[PDB]
Ligand SMILES: *[C@@H]1O[C@H](CO)[C@@H](O)[C@H](O)[C@H]1NC(C)=O
Ligand SMILES: *[C@@H]1O[C@H](CO)[C@@H](O)[C@H](O)[C@H]1NC(C)=O
């Protein structure tokens with residue numbers, strides 16, 4: 001009998017976590033009277049399951065999921081979760097910046113590892129730029145995914161600068177993520 | 189019996205759509221006005237019996253065409269409807285962009301900030317409304333009146349090989365090459381260069 | 387023809403659509419929904435058609451949606467308070483879509499969309515196009531607007 005039943009989204013994917021062999025199923029909102037089992041988490045011993053890129057899934061509506069504890073001796077009742085509308089509740093992930101330098105220009109390009117069944121989400125990122133241990137950082141304008149942010153560089157000295165970025169997903173309302181791990185390098 | 193509103197126009201800049209009009213000559217008393225927009229079903233009311241000479245229509249869909257009408261009302265009698273048609277994507281004015289300018293020796297780094305849409309968000313600006321947005325930059329040496337044009341690929345550009353210790357003024361505007369529609373220019377920002385060429 | 391602008395819809399418009407889908411779902415649960423021979427979702431994806439044929443399929447789905455929700459706003463005025471702005475937008479997209487257009491999987495699809503209003507209950511069609519509302523806007527319209535980049 002698993003108690004905590006949580007259907008959460010983290011880094012462009014939907015996971016189901018439960019706390020006490022396990023069986024997990026899902027139900028689509030249009031197919032309300034139909035459940036469907038997960039083949040990957042069939043008899044698993046973990047406490048989380050990937051609810052992303054399922055066989056007959058429909059991320060364009062809300063869906064719930066249920067999980068029950070099983071054993072060679074008994075079966076526990078199903079414990080369904082709350083609904084999660086993907087397009088409105090998905091949490092994005094911080095990008096990975098590809099840093100290149102040309103003359104006095106530093107370009108910070110964002111890259112993403114995205115699930116294959118992901119809808120065509122509108123991703124933009126905000127780059128943070130600052131010297132290592134400054135306190136005051138520099139936020140640049142919101143930039144589309146696929147275009148680099150070009151940054152003016154002072155040629156003198158060789159100061160340790162760090163770079164960070166965060167993703168902004170915008171469908172009905174902007175949804176911000178945390179900032180990535182700051183990538184620090186040797187400016188010149 | 190009641191005169192209609194005169195000079196009825198739609199002042200729209202960056203999809204801030206303000207229906208402006210001038211109050212006609214009336215001697216019996218203070219007039220009031222009622223503006224309507226044609227929704228999908230019927231003319232819905234926006235401003236009802238206001239004393240102002242304008243009404244906010246920024247909540248309009250901004251896709252497609254809208255029909256707007258306004259009339260003047262005094263006591264129970266009212267004037268005729270003055271009706272206009274407004275297409276936001278085509279009739280709105282593209283405001284000036286922002287421009288951050290930095291001086292670096294004989295170079296000149298300028299970043300362009302998009303014109304903001306108040307009722308939208310930072311991730312949906314005027315640059316995102318039009319599919320063929322491109323900035324348009326114009327600069328000159330202060331006092332020469334000889335303008336030079338440049339079309340940057342994105343929201344950043346560098347003006348290299350300039351004259352040292354010389355003041356240059358720069359402007360930026362939106363532009364749509366599919367229609368050859370130009371936005372308003374930014375206010376001229378003038379900055380002085382330093383020395384030496386790399 | 388210039389539908390490339392519809393890759394990114396204005397968020398305020400999507401907030402208006404989201405209020406519509408939330409309002410329709412409240413009315414669909416009390417009506418007689420879920421009829422036999424369902425049409426949405428279509429079993430195949432629009433990328434499996436040629437770029438010039440994708441607007442044709444999208445037009446027939448959008449015209450059905452517009453026809454159903456227009457009949458829904460006239461049935462329930464209270465429900466039409468929210469559907470009004472969505473209806474205006476769907477109509478405009480449909481107008482822009484028809485400007486890009488002159489027995490395979492497209493013939494049978496266009497056929498079932500055409501032979502569904504005459505052989506299905508209203509509450510079913512209402513429920514069928516409601517759950518397909520953001521499939522159409524976020525995926526199908528996006529693909530058609532992306533032209534030769536949707537593949
Ligand atoms: C979920 O688990 C946490 C600890 O993991 C607990 O504090 C909380 O009460 C649980 N929620 C329930 C039982 O609803
Ligand atoms: C996000 O999930 C994808 C798989 O869906 C993975 O490739 C990527 O590394 C993850 N990013 C994180 C955990 O930051």
Ligand SMILES: *[C@@H]1O[C@H](CO)[C@@H](O)[C@H](O)[C@H]1NC(C)=O
Nearest residue numbers: 109110111112145146147148
């Ligand atoms: C930056 O990364 C994106 C990843 O989506 C890629 O499409 C693009 O080619 C990269 N380079 C530039 C200059 O944007």
